[PDB]
Amino acid sequence: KTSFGSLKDEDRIFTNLYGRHDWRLKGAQSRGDWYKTKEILLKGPDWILGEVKTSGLRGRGGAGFPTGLKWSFMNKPSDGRPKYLVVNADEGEPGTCKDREIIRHDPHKLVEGCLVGGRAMGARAAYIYIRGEFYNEASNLQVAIREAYEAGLIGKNACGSGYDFDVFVVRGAGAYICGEETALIESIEGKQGKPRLKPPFPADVGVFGCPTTVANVETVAVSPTICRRGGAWFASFGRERNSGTKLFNISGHVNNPCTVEEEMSVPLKELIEKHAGGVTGGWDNLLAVIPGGSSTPLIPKSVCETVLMDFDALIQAQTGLGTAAVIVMDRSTDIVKAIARLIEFYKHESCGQCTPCREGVDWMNKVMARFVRGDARPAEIDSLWEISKQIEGHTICALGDGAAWPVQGLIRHFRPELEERMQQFAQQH
């Protein structure tokens, strides 16, 4: 294929995205969840890991690592420690809200995914870390887990397969950084949400100092379907190395901001117009898009005209797919203020552990604040570019990268707006 989009509803995985059907066990089973789960568990981890590899599934938490190879780090003989699957339901990236819909409307996909994914990893239990603000969502997930226990689908002798598996839910307490995979582990252990250095990698030393895999909610919740319908089925959607379906969030200045499932590699223009009702004020009223959540660099309208929504297409546009959260800004937006407010967000979420982000992000924030008013000189723009490059690649975790990239996108595509603002301040003073 060379064209993507127009995903058929028979090919949509999250068939209860909008919560118009019973989310509890009876509704989930009637839609195809928990079907032949024993047979999947009896095929063994190597077969399960084989399907995931053949599917071309990539991490849906924002980094997009190939899932089959990542999960295979856990397929090693036991050294005596317990093994765990940690499901990352922190869902903290601004613009992102797809994992919220799975947890409250398709919780039994996530629970079954935890079992199927945990079997492939050899885990004994799954810890689902869910942000503390998602209290009602966490309560729904907990009711679904109880249903799954009472039906024998999880627990001792799960699905009758002879495999023991537990599913714990542990709530967060308000921290974007706790979505980072090793900060999440540190939080489950009762410490501050400060990321770990690597190595060790979690597959060797993770939660409680044990073999551990952290997987995104969307990543785990699709694993049972990939196994039932085949990795070949999943790989048949999207471009090569960009396989599958994807949950998109379209927010900002669109007519009908929404969450939808669509084929990977759909054009950004097609996605905004078909599902979100188009850009407020028309397509020509578009100024810029943030394609993959606040951490990804913005792209201007000229780039949005033809860009495809997948990992490799957006990297060539000098940004990334990220969580696939699309924040649209129309021509009435103060683009400098919009990005400045994202830098303020990163200033509030920095764990403060490491120097470049503890000091640098707060420094970038003060500079962006003056750029909004124009109270600066054009020489400071290149100074700000160099500052962001001293943070990127020098910090412990990717939050420092996630703060530098939005600034670089703004300077990359909107330098004349920044300079014009400085020129205006110079006259009025």
Binding site: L197, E349, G352, C354, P356, R358, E359, Q390, H394
Partner: protein, 263 residues
């Protein structure tokens, strides 16, 4: 037999498995710059001053924490390495207070000296600086926490060496603060050692306050007699007066610590 070969600026060196990049560098006599790393504490990897380029690796690695792999070539003076140090030093100094004349660390300050040797020679920071309130932790250790660079050495020392878990960090981000949260005195027989290991003038000897500068002191290597451990010490004197007592490193006796009574 178990040793692996790595290169430091292209020089072959044989190290045990688990040896860090930082440890490999010291075998050929190079000392990687550091703030948070201390050889007697647990690795932290938060200051980032020790970042170093590995040849053919696009990303600089924290030398203090990263184990070296076979065949690695550590580039301790490449442009990538030097620029990482300059950027990190710039971040450390952005909010650091202009206190050197009134600060007791001046003249024997790792922040001063590593700024001279690895940092830039000027500033491009144009904002206001952070200011932090002081914490009272007893009559021995004066705190000027605006100078703290959040290296967590004192926290690790108190927990691991002294076995006291009363120090930590509160808050988040640029506002993260080292201290006790509550009003608490850090009185431990080994407490005065946090003065030595604090790289900056954040933690200083209250008795020593303002009395001397390091360059004018004469150093007399001697022995403690306040107990029978025989801790090795340095007696600092100036113009015929004893000014203070410092630990002298002895691996088989006191390592690099002394008790409060000795100090």
């Amino acid at each position: 037999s178990n040793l692996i070969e790595v290169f430091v600026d292209g020089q072959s060196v044989m190290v045990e498995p688990g040896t860090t990049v930082l440890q490999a560098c010291e075998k050929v006599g190079m000392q990687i710059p550091r703030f948070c790393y201390h050889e007697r504490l647990s690795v932290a990897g938060n200051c980032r001053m020790c970042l170093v380029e590995i040849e053919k690796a696009p990303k600089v690695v924290a030398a203090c924490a990263m184990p070296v792999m076979k065949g690695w070539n550590i580039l301790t003076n490449s442009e990538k390495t030097k620029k990482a140090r300059e950027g990190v030093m710039e971040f450390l100094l952005a909010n650091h207070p202009l206190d050197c004349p009134i600060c007791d660390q001046g003249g024997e300050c790792d922040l001063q000296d590593q700024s001279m040797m690895f940092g830039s020679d000027r500033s491009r920071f144009l904002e206001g600086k952070r200011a932090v309130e002081d914490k009272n932790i007893g009559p021995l250790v004066k705190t000027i926490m605006t100078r703290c660079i959040q290296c967590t050495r004192c926290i690790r020392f108190a927990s691991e060496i002294a076995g006291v878990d009363d120090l930590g960090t509160t808050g988040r981000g640029n506002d993260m603060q080292v201290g006790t949260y509550i009003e608490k005195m850090f009185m431990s027989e080994l407490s005065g050692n946090i003065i030595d290991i604090c790289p900056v003038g954040a933690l200083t000897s209250k008795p020593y306050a303002f009395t001397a500068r390091p360059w004018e002191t004469r150093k007399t290597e001697s022995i403690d007699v306040m107990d029978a451990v025989g801790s090795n010490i340095v007696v600092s004197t100036r113009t015929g007066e004893v000014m203070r007592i410092l630990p002298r490193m002895h691996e088989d006796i006191n390592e690099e610590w002394i008790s409060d009574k000795t100090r």
